Amino acid sequence: CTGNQQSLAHSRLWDAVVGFLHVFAHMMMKLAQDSSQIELLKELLDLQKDMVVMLLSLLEGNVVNGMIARQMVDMLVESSSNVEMILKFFDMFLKLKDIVGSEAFQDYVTDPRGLISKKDFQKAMDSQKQFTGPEIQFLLSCSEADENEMINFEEFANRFQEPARDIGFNVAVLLTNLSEHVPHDPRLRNFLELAESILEYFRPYLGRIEIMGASRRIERIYFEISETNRAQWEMPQVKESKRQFIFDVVNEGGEAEKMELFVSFCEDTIFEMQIAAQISEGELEVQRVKFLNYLSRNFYTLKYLALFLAFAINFILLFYKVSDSPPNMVYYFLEESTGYMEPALWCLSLLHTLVAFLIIIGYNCLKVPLVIFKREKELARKLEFDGLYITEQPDVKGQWDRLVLNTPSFPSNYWDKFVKRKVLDKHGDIFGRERIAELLGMDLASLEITAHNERTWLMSIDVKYQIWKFGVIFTDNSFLYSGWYMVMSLLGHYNNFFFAAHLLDIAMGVKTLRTILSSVTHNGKQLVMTVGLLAVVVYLYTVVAFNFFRKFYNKSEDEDEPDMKCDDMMTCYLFHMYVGVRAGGGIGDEIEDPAGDEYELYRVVFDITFFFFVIVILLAIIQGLIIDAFGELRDQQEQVKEDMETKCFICGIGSDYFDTTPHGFETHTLEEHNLANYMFFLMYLINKDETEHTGQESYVWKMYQERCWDFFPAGDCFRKQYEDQLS
Amino acid sequence: MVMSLLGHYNNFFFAAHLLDIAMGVKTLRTILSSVTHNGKQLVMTVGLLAVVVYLYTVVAFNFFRKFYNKSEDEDEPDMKCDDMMTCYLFHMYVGVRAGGGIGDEIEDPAGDEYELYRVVFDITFFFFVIVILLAIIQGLIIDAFG
Amino acid sequence: ELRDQQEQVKEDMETKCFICGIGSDYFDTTPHGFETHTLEEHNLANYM
Amino acid sequence: GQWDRLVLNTPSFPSNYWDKFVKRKVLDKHGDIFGRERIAELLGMDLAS
Ligand SMILES: Cc1cc(C(F)(C(F)(F)F)C(F)(F)F)ccc1NC(=O)c1cccc(I)c1C(=O)NC(C)(C)CS(C)(=O)=O
Ligand SMILES: Cc1cc(C(F)(C(F)(F)F)C(F)(F)F)ccc1NC(=O)c1cccc(I)c1C(=O)NC(C)(C)CS(C)(=O)=O
Ligand SMILES: Nc1ncnc2c1ncn2[C@@H]1O[C@H](COP(=O)(O)OP(=O)(O)OP(=O)(O)O)[C@@H](O)[C@H]1O
Ligand SMILES: Nc1ncnc2c1ncn2[C@@H]1O[C@H](COP(=O)(O)OP(=O)(O)OP(=O)(O)O)[C@@H](O)[C@H]1O
Ligand SMILES: Cn1c(=O)c2c(ncn2C)n(C)c1=O
Ligand SMILES: [Ca+2]
Ligand SMILES: [Zn+2]
Ligand SMILES: [Zn+2]
């Protein structure tokens, strides 16, 4: 609201702030000289944290060159000599941790207790040339004396770091906000170099983002990112979902759902991260949980020991021979005279059947939730928004899903556990409350009569919900492939040739191969037709042979024994389709010459036409289709890599508009619109309270809690509105 | 230099310098870099050929050993498909080069015993290998040239 | 080629208006801009 | 890189790269931050002398 931000811009509020600036720079530098003064100083840092966030919330709704920004900067330079004293206090107490991490001063202490001598550590700071002369006696006075041989550099590093943590980040926000807001202020240029160390210690934990709300203006929004949110973001199990999410959105997804899939992806990744935090490192439950944690943690590598074994049980098997007298036919092993192979074969079989099971359990305990999360989310959301069932009517998927609504735990992974009430209330009467409570199993009256508002897993394991979950998982594809790998492994103990069907998983995983495997199924609906066309053409050329050319079809040399393959038309047709399309010269290559004048010319056309139509055209098209489907699937993976280096993926502005300066597009992508920044912003919003969301924060949040996507830039990024007014 | 020097050992080595015409002559040097341009995705295709011919060797070693008698002599039986390490080499040697698939080099399935199954074995070995993969490869090669 | 003539159609019908020769970019400066434009401004069904 | 980490001690590291004073430059610019004497030992400069 401007009407308050105008009145605050015209009082003596700056002159109030200047007095608060002068008391802050002098209270700390007096209070930093005792251990028994530290209780007071933590309160002071939390106070000026709340002061500068008032300055930030005063500087929201800010234009690039506005007088509020200009009254902010001269007030900082009317309060110069103290505001560097607070800046140098942040600057000295941050390099103190980075200096003491060097081994040059751990070598300067020879005490095994760690109690470094004061004058010894005094010349240590005098050895490095970054601090000043008065700084070390300021630091020696900050240190404890303890018979002048003990400063205890370890506790001295982190003592004044954790209470000074958020405020040192927060002051860097305001400095980098205003410097990004107004250009050409050399006092700010004096300020930014004076506070360089607090920038780089608080640049990775910072994140920038740019949203456009509040009557068509984009503005830089800033936030904190924890160490924990960046730790479980740079995991490959999270990253593999992203690389797929990059693919199927820019390839087949339109510009509309791009953002809707993005926040859905932001929902799903946030999920996997919760369940990865769940598994991060009488007692039957405890032992089993340790077992599961061990499994899932190794899960990525337990697949490699399954691949090895399987490539070994083969090199062994590749040594079978057959004979009558078993040293009827008795399959046995060559016995190459190495370590007894049979024994090792049995051992590896066992293993390959165990290390499969423990590949199934891992999948069940890792990738299941994120699927029974994707289903629950999508369902509930297409329920309380589109009113799928109560108003409209369904898709085998939908019919199957119309089974858990009665369940007492419908939202079992979808965080929102109140999606029951919402739908009822929003269609309360329109479709009959009691009817809706019956459909959803809420128990209406008693439900709302729940005392909550007013005032042994096997033991109670709901059956019906388990049935729904198993149905949906068995409907999954990747679980079916792991079920097939288990079933083949198990069946292998029946006959080791089945340990030659795991041998085959090298293929379905090895990238360049997996493409060649999807080629067939990519357009089978238009390759099966071609095969069928081959079947019908060979049919038509079989019928004529069965009406006029039966005479020639005698593939038996024996004078007496006549074969006459072309008598039972079901036999002639198979003869053609078996040795016809494989002759390479057509059918006429496998029958007697037409030298006989009888129908000689007609057969001379039958041969040539069968060859040309089939073995030159169709046995070509097919190959054609195949090779092609292999080429296109090698381009869909190309266009992505192309455009991700050409478009911003948030706004549809190419790289040319950001090529009018070095690293223009690069910098734009790297800080203006890193989508990682957006996904972090979503987590930061979800984490903090509601009573603390600032204006723009609460605004974007409340436009998210009802699924409106008008707060993404999509058309201009802070260099099309203010391009002229900023250099 | 090493080939030239070794040539004095046996003049056929003066047929390895003969080959430098190639590595310098532009239009050729391209054809030579084609193979190494994407070998990481052509070696995989070869390997896929190896594995498919393997899978079609195993079935022949479990049900079709009977047919694999490439020796005409009445007495002397060859039976190439007895030592699986022998049957697999027989396939990978005269299989992918038949141009009509493996079924072009064995006795006819006229015998009703497993006649239909062999009529599918032949056609599938031909289609999957000699029409698809021995095509892709050529494909990869020609492309890398384009 | 006969598999591309059927491609270009599906491409451009999602790129041009078919009544005015204005692409989808000019109607991309707002959500569903091109979509709304096609759906009410120029549904040729409306003309017929 | 590992192989290149062999000539830094050599008395003639910049043998074709015209700049033959690239020894001093690096020392001076990281003079203390990483220990002069340590850097002179790494680069075979013989610091003081
Ligand atoms: C380890 C491995 C390496 C290679 C390499 F080719 C590559 F280059 F790709 F890495 C090689 F390293 F060998 F060179 C190929 C496949 C595997 N196999 C598995 O990961 C594995 C093992 C057992 C059970 C299952 I399930 C799997 C497994 O995850 N399979 C699939 C096919 C990837 C599962 S899916 C159908 O994609 O969901
Ligand atoms: C003279 C010549 C002509 C032709 C013509 F084909 C062309 F049209 F290209 F000019 C021809 F004139 F014959 F038509 C082709 C190759 C040569 N060979 C050499 O230059 C030669 C000789 C000996 C040792 C070496 I080393 C070379 C030589 O430089 N080789 C390479 C292969 C170019 C060296 S590299 C691997 O490229 O570094
Ligand atoms: N808004 C964006 N516009 C264009 N490209 C983007 C955008 N956001 C991220 N990227 C892309 O993300 C990539 C970041 O580099 P990086 O290699 O780390 O990611 P990756 O190639 O997908 O694989 P990974 O990060 O897992 O190693 C860059 O290619 C960068 O272009
Ligand atoms: N003026 C127009 N510009 C671009 N596209 C148009 C225009 N008018 C109609 N269309 C196209 O007509 C299609 C309407 O969707 P719809 O699927 O119903 O038609 P269809 O795909 O041709 O087949 P059918 O309507 O018979 O089911 C949209 O793809 C829409 O882009
Ligand atoms: C896991 N999770 C989310 O993913 C989420 C949320 N609110 C919004 N989202 C996206 N809550 C409360 C939540 O617990
Ligand atoms: Ca508030
Ligand atoms: Zn952008
Ligand atoms: Zn129009």
CA distance C43 to C34: 12
Which distant-in-sequence residues (6+ apart) come within 8 Å of A296 by Cβ?
A279, A362, A365, A366
Nearest-by-CA chain A residue for B59:
A497
Sole residue written with tokens 């990747």: A478
**Cβ pair B57, B27 in contact under 8 A:** no
Which DSSP string corresponds to A382-438? HHHTT-TTTTS---HHHHHHTTTTTSTTS-SSSS---HHHHHHHHTTTTT-HHHHHH
3-state secondary structure of A405: coil
Backbone φ/ψ region at A23: left (φ over 0), alpha (ψ -120 to 50), beta: alpha
Query: Is the beta carbon of B99 within 6 A of some atom in ligand 2?
Result: no
CA distance D41 to D43: 6
Nearest 5°: CA angle at A50, between A48 and A55? Answer: 90
Strand partners, A333: A320
Taking the alpha carbons of B67, B72, B75, B81 in that order, is the dihedral positive or negative? negative
**Cβ pair A153, A100 in contact under 8 A:** yes
- Give A613's DSSP letter: I
Strand partners, A213: A217
CA distance A38 to A45: 11
Query: Is the beta carbon of C19 within 6 A of some atom in ligand 4?
Result: yes
3-state secondary structure of A53: helix
Q: Do chains A and B touch (3 or more CB pairs under 8 A)?
A: yes
3-state secondary structure of A201: coil
Task: Say if the Cβ atoms of D33 and A127 lie within 8 Å.
Answer: no
Burial class (CB in 10 A: 0-12, 13-18, 19+), A704: middle
Strand partners, A320: A333
Give the closest-approach CA distance of A712 to chain B in angstroms: 40
Nearest 5°: CA angle at A563, between A561 and A566? Answer: 155
Backbone φ/ψ region at D30: left (φ over 0), alpha (ψ -120 to 50), beta: alpha
Structure tokens at B118: 């062999």
Taking the alpha carbons of A580, A582, A586, A591 in that order, is the dihedral positive or negative? negative
**Cβ pair A654, C28 in contact under 8 A:** no
**Cβ pair A574, A536 in contact under 8 A:** no
If we measure between CA atoms, which residue out of A70, A47, A277 comes closest to residue A164?
A47
Name the phi and psi angles at D13, rounded to 5. -40, -55
From chain D, the residues in CB contact with A129 under 8 A are 31-32
From chain A, the residues in CB contact with B122 under 8 A are 578, 582
Chains near D, with 3+ CB pairs < 8 A? A
Amino acid A538 reads: V
From chain D, the residues in CB contact with A128 under 8 A are 32-33
**Cβ pair B82, B65 in contact under 8 A:** yes
Which distant-in-sequence residues (6+ apart) come within 8 Å of B75 by Cβ?
none
**Cβ pair A395, A382 in contact under 8 A:** no
To one decimal, the resolution in angstroms is 3.9
Query: Is the beta carbon of C37 within 6 A of some atom in ligand 4?
Result: no
End-to-end, the C-alpha distance of chain B in Å comes to 33
Structure tokens at C25: 């970019």
Q: Which of A649, A651, A667 to mutate to test the pocket of ligand 3 (most atoms within 8 A of CB)?
A: A649
User: Which pairs with CB-CB distance under 8 Å and at least 24 residues apart come from A694-701?
Assistant: A694/A53, A694/A56, A694/A57, A694/A60, A695/A57, A695/A60, A695/A61, A696/A60, A696/A211, A696/A213, A696/A214, A696/A219, A696/A221, A697/A221, A699/A213, A699/A214, A700/A211, A700/A213, A700/A221
Sole residue written with tokens 């238009």: A526
A648 labelled binding-site residue? yes
CA distance A252 to A244: 12
Residue C42 C-alpha to ligand 8 middle, in angstroms?
5
The enclosing H or E element of A220 equals: strand A217-224
If we measure between CA atoms, which residue out of D38, D30, D44 comes closest to residue A104?
D38
If we measure between CA atoms, which residue out of C29, B63, B47, B128 comes closest to residue A626?
B128
Burial class (CB in 10 A: 0-12, 13-18, 19+), B89: middle
Nearest-by-CA chain B residue for A507:
B48
Strand partners, A217: A213
Strand partners, A211: A219
Structure tokens at B69: 């008698």
Residue B134: other Cβ atoms inside 10 A: 16
Burial class (CB in 10 A: 0-12, 13-18, 19+), A673: buried
Largest pairwise CA distance in chain A: 126
From chain A, the residues in CB contact with D33 under 8 A are 128
Structure tokens at A321: 């021979």
Sole residue written with tokens 């990744």: A269
CA distance A103 to A127: 13
Task: Say if the Cβ atoms of A511 and B44 lie within 8 Å.
Answer: yes
Task: Say if the Cβ atoms of C32 and A256 lie within 8 Å.
Answer: yes
Within 13 Å, how many C-alpha atoms sit on residue A617's CB side?
12
CA distance A612 to A620: 11
Nearest 5°: CA angle at A539, between A534 and A544? Answer: 135
Give the closest-approach CA distance of B100 to chain A in angstroms: 5
CA distance A310 to A306: 6
Backbone φ/ψ region at A387: left (φ over 0), alpha (ψ -120 to 50), beta: left
Q: From the centroid of its chain, how far is CA A159?
A: 37
β-pairing verdict for A217-224 and A206-213: antiparallel
Query: Is the beta carbon of A508 within 6 A of some atom in ligand 1?
Result: yes
Of B51, B83, B136, the CB nearest to A507: B51
Structure tokens at B6: 């070794």
If we measure between CA atoms, which residue out of A22, A12, A32, A41 comes closest to residue A84?
A22
